[PDB]
From a paper:
MrgD, a member of the Mas-related G protein-coupled receptor (MRGPR) family, has high basal activity for Gi activation. It recognizes endogenous ligands, such as β-alanine, and is involved in pain and itch signaling. Mas-related-G protein-coupled receptor D (MrgD) is expressed in sensory dorsal root ganglia (DRG) neurons, the cardiovascular system, and the retina.
In the case of the apo state, no ligand was added during all the purification steps. We improved the density using local refinement covering only the TM domain on cryoSPARC. The overall structures in the apo and β-alanine-bound states are similar, but the ligand-binding pocket shows a marked difference. In the apo state, the side chain of W2416.55 faces the cytoplasmic side and is sandwiched between Y1063.33 and Y1093.36. This interaction stabilizes the close contact between TM3 and TM6 even in the absence of the ligand. We then focused on the two prominent hydrogen bonds between the side chain of Y1093.36 and the backbone carbonyl of S2346.48 and the other between the side chains of S2346.48 and S2687.45 in both the apo and β-alanine-bound states. Measurement of the basal activity of the mutants of these residues revealed that the Y109A, Y106F, and S234A mutations reduced the basal activity, suggesting that these two hydrogen bonds are involved in the basal activity of MrgD. We also performed MD simulations to investigate the stability of the apo and β-alanine-bound states without G proteins. In terms of the ligand-binding site, the conformation was more flexible, and the RMSD was much higher for the apo state than the β-alanine-bound state.
Residue numbers in the entry: 22 to 285
Amino acid sequence: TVHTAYLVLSSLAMFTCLCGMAGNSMVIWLLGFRMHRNPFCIYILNLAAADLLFLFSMASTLSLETQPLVNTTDKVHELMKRLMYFAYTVGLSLLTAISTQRCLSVLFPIWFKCHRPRHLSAWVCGLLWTLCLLMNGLTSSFCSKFLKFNEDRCFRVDMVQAALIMGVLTPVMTLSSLTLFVWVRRSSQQWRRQPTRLFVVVLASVLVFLICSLPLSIYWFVLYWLSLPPEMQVLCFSLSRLSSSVSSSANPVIYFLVGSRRSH
Ligand SMILES: CCCCCCCCCCCCCCCC(=O)O
Ligand SMILES: CCCCCCCCCCCCCCCC(=O)O
Ligand SMILES: CCCCCCCCCCCCCCCC(=O)O
Ligand SMILES: CCCCCCCCCCCCCCCC(=O)O
Ligand SMILES: CCCCCCCCCCCCCCCC(=O)O
Ligand SMILES: CCCCCCCCCCCCCCCC(=O)O
Ligand SMILES: CCCCCCCCCCCCCCCC(=O)O
């Protein structure tokens, strides 16, 4: 029944949350202060931190939804839900940044080598964290039922957040990955041996992004603008949570173990 399909879909989410926390802790330990001559490692460290925050927040959320939410809980529950959302948004922004950096490394290699600011990843990540925190401090301040809660303002701030996420982070990331794919297939695979690994990893990252991370972003959009039945909305929420869980738990595998050159 519905309860069984919720319990099963939440147990998997908790298990993959624990696995993702372990993987991101390993990535932070193995890359926190080293491997930093690489221009690609600052984004990966920040993404690992963001994914660890996401998985910890939503693991706590899933743990404390078993308990009744009346007076003691349901106040930390909202805090950790906003933490989950903020970490999800910053992780999506960091994935877009990683894909754009990879595309620029091959579209403009001279700039990436001898003209890129050496701290550009650092303050790009700082700007992403600051902007995500600011946007989530508006979504929470206008839609949480423990703050200056409103009805006409929640819808506007959500139509800002979801529209920005989808119609900016999806086109930019997918277009950058497609351009990198096309450039490698045309100007690099034609002369020497075809880099099948590059095609495989780019396609896998794009597929994981679109099929796993984006469902949680579009669930907020389809909650409004459409009269979803209240019985099946919990199923959609569970699907979105598990998809984002899988994406965050697999990010260390497809961004660190694949990109492990100093660990050799
Ligand atoms: C409100 C949106 C503002 C714009 C956000 C754009 C996020 C993706 C692009 C910026 C991050 C990556 C920039 C290139 C990184 C690099 O190659 O050094
Ligand atoms: C406001 C949105 C865009 C933010 C862009 C932040 C900086 C991104 C990294 C540098 C992009 C340009 C790279 C060199 C391009 C070139 O000259 O060929
Ligand atoms: C919550 C706001 C702050 C979030 C973190 C800010 C960005 C931190 C970036 C990683 C650590 C600094 C890295 C600087 C560059 C380097 O050491 O090579
Ligand atoms: C990093 C992604 C998000 C980047 C942009 C963050 C801020 C988005 C907009 C916030 C809500 C603004 C709503 C309108 C406010 C007004 O008209 O006064
Ligand atoms: C403190 C940093 C994170 C939050 C930054 C964004 C601004 C938060 C507050 C937004 C609402 C401001 C107006 C409140 C009006 C009211 O009291 O109803
Ligand atoms: C991470 C910080 C985000 C911004 C928060 C700014 C403060 C928003 C207002 C909080 C008011 C709390 C007390 C009144 C609550 C209520 O009237 O419902
Ligand atoms: C990451 C952004 C977090 C923004 C702040 C979220 C706060 C959610 C509510 C927490 C409990 C607030 C309790 C005091 C106000 C009240 O009495 O309702």
